[model samples]
Target: GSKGTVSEPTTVAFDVRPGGVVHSFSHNVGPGDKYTCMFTYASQGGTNEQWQMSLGTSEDHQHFTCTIWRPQGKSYLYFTQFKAEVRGAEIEYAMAYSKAAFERESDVPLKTEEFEVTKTAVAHRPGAFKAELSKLVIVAKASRTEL
Candidate 1:
């Protein structure tokens, strides 16, 4: 029974301290540098609440989402994708970045989730929203390594 608020509310979600759109993160590097992303988002009892993340910009990529239901009743239809690579010729510094632009269709069910409002607000497309977002994380190490 977690409800969203103007500022914060009782709900399980990612920390969008900086922002939800155009957001990025970084981390220190070492021989054993590790990176992990929690892509799955859960909704108590909503339909199509889960969203997806894409790494490289491209078309024809399938979208996926997570669900609280066991058999995909109201799960996230969008799967998150991200990639890590070298930023510059430095080689030693590695950066991980991700970006995505989502357009909601009437075919897709709307649920009690964040970012969905933007999708519903669009009148021209009826139920479509354009979102440009980014996230970057850096890993530094003694030796030059490709991220």
Candidate 2:
């Protein structure tokens, strides 16, 4: 049998409806494309529930990975929405693992690292430099706001 060819990474948007005890979202991928999932946490109440993101070619032979940041976990992860063109490539744990309001006691903090850039320009240095600068600027702005 001939092997299947994988396609380039395409944007996958998984729309989640609220009020589900157990919610799951999946994107179909070919044998060639790497199954990468990235998402941000939109904590409603407490942040104790752990969710797993499984990436593999087939469902039967799948692996599981879980988010580990506890109470003080950073809202923004390594790969964010803006950075990745693919919408749902980075999977964010929206609700709790089993139930929605199991840990709904404390209030989840808002995200402070979101940037508002006006223009996109080419930089002489590598993309890492620009990303570091962007994070620093966001942090500086957050600090100033705290004062």
Candidate 3:
């Protein structure tokens, strides 16, 4: 009864890996922290694969791993300005998205919407050089009701 108080609210939060080039990486949150996920299509032309991160809790920074799938569908609702990591086509994509965020892509030359950042994060590289994930733009919503 009291043990199962309530399920905490879930939201999307994301960041880029160091060196602006992340073949794979993960993100995690703690009790009062929020779950964050980020995807950048800067690395286009990638093979279909899944990348994952996990949530670790400790008195200090702890490292761990998990088998989690990246985000899917076009359900996100906002954007923030984080430094872009240029690799593959990511550099360009970052600029494009930041400049024209949430703008409809159905009418555009291509279905940019299909190139989901959440989906792309899970994709694997087919050849040399993946995208660079320099500075990350952390976009997350409040799990606990914000004060």
Worst 10 residues of 3 by lDDT: 86-95
TM-score: model 3 vs. ground truth: 0.22
Tell me each candidate's TM-score: 0.16, 0.21, 0.22
2 versus 3: better TM-score goes to: 3
lDDT of each: 0.24, 0.25, 0.28
lDDT of 1 by residue, 13-105 (tens): 233222122334333211243322222121122232322222221121111111111122222223232223322111222222123223452
Total colliding residue pairs, candidate 1: 15
Report the lDDT tens digits of candidate 2 across residue range 1-147. Answer: 244543232334333222222343434344433343333212223223332222332233232222222222222222212221112123222212111122555433323333322212111122322221111111001011133
Order the candidate numbers by TM-score, best to worst: 3, 2, 1
Locate the minimum summed-lDDT window of 10 residues in model 2: 134-143
Which lDDT value does model 3 have at 12? Answer: 37
Where model 1 places Cα greater than 4 Å from the true spot, the runs are 1-14, 18-20, 31-83, 86-147
